[PDB]
Amino acid sequence: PRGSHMSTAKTLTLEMHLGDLMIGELSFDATADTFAVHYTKDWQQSGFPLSPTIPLDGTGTSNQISMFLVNLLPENKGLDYLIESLGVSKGNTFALIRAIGLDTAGAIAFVPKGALLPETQLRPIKAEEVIQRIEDPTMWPMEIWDGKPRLSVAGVQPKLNLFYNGKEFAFAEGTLSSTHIVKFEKYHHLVINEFITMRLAKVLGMNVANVDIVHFGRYKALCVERFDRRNIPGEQRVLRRHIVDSCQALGFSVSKKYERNFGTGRDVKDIREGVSFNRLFSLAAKCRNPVAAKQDMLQWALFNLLTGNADAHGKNYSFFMTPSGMEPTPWYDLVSVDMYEDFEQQLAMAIDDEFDPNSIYAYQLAAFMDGLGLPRNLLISNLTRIARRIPQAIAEVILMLPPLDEDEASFVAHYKTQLLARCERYLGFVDEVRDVEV
Ligand SMILES: Nc1ncnc2c1ncn2[C@@H]1O[C@H](COP(=O)(O)OP(=O)(O)NP(=O)(O)O)[C@@H](O)[C@H]1O
Ligand SMILES: [Mg+2]
Ligand SMILES: [Mg+2]
Ligand code: NA
Known part of the structure; x- marks a missing residue:
């Protein structure tokens, strides 16, 4: 220089x-x-x-x-x-x-600035390399390969962001970038859980990320296709689309991902400074199509209720950034958290000041809509439609599953039972919403 x-x-x-x-x-x-x-x-x-x-x-x-x-x-x-x-x-x-x-x-x-990029290439991965990491995370941390840390996406669950074209996985280096996020389970049947939940959204016609179950030896992992990426067919080049999560969109710290941003502690139960539904919906105004964005957010909320997703926090909803405004991304990280009954759960975002999913009735839903300034009929129509379509959708999704062992089949049976029960519960009072005096 x-x-x-x-x-x-x-x-x-x-x-x-x-x-x-x-x-x-x-x-x-x-x-x-x-x-x-x-x-x-x-x-x-x-x-x-x-x-x-x-x-x-x-x-x-x-x-x-x-x-x-x-x-x-x-x-x-x-x-x-x-x-x-x-x-x-x-x-x-x-x-x-x-x-x-x-x-x-x-x-x-x-x-x-003014530095030579690392060489643009792939670092292919063998299944056996993933297996030793699953089996001995202490000797073989999942995130370190060839002595270098590799993880460059958020979220608390163990995972790798990888390049993938349907056969083998690799780390992208240089100007290349990852195309998929592979998520590993540290809780029983979590891969099957998220696979079913994500595929259910897809069959219902929702805007949701594509997922496959992949195998590393006997172990299952969830392979999620990134929507901030597009590998160009016919060449080695990955185009990117910019996204931000709702925390970023609101200008909030990672510490505000949950509405109760200081935690479950009862001394802080009324400190609700994190991403809430009212705050999330406020972002629709910055979207290219505000009304469509609010409909998506509402469908997301209802879907999450029906599937028992108590972890729908601010980093689990994102938007594309474009010259003409934001656009909600396809959904991701949809899991029936309700299935883990060794844990007492709260909604990430309250509905009518209610954080207990079991205590959401027609009153809470009517108050929710009134407080968002949206007509109740939009909730009534969507909730009824989704709940009624779920019996066929879940039957369709179960056909998408790979071979299951006995314990896995029982999990899927319980998943379905609980899912159908939530649907019937909400259908039991959805027609009250219209008549509620909030
Ligand atoms: N399909 C996708 N396309 C693009 N980015 C994605 C996609 N899925 C996830 N991400 C991003 O990766 C992050 C982690 O993915 P996520 O599936 O939420 O993992 P997680 O460990 O289950 N997160 P959480 O349980 O909420 O702490 C998200 O917060 C997004 O920023
Ligand atoms: Mg997440
Ligand atoms: Mg998650
Ligand atoms: Na929660």
């Missing part, structure tokens, strides 16, 4: 790339301990911001940038392995983003 040769001229700036296009810079001021994000003039006129709170005019606050970036980070053991591998402090978000920057959720690659 003809200018400054100080290391910091390169190391304090991560360029922001969308494919082969540089759209701006994420800079970190050492002295102030702050982040900043500025975009190119072409991108300001033509593109979209990283999130609604990191605007194209470049005035995004350090704190909003920081929380946005933290929301991109792993939430499981993968985070600790990453920190350890780099030798950095926990709060050094900049270094962590540098580390995972070539493949984060969404479409933006964070690339060190």
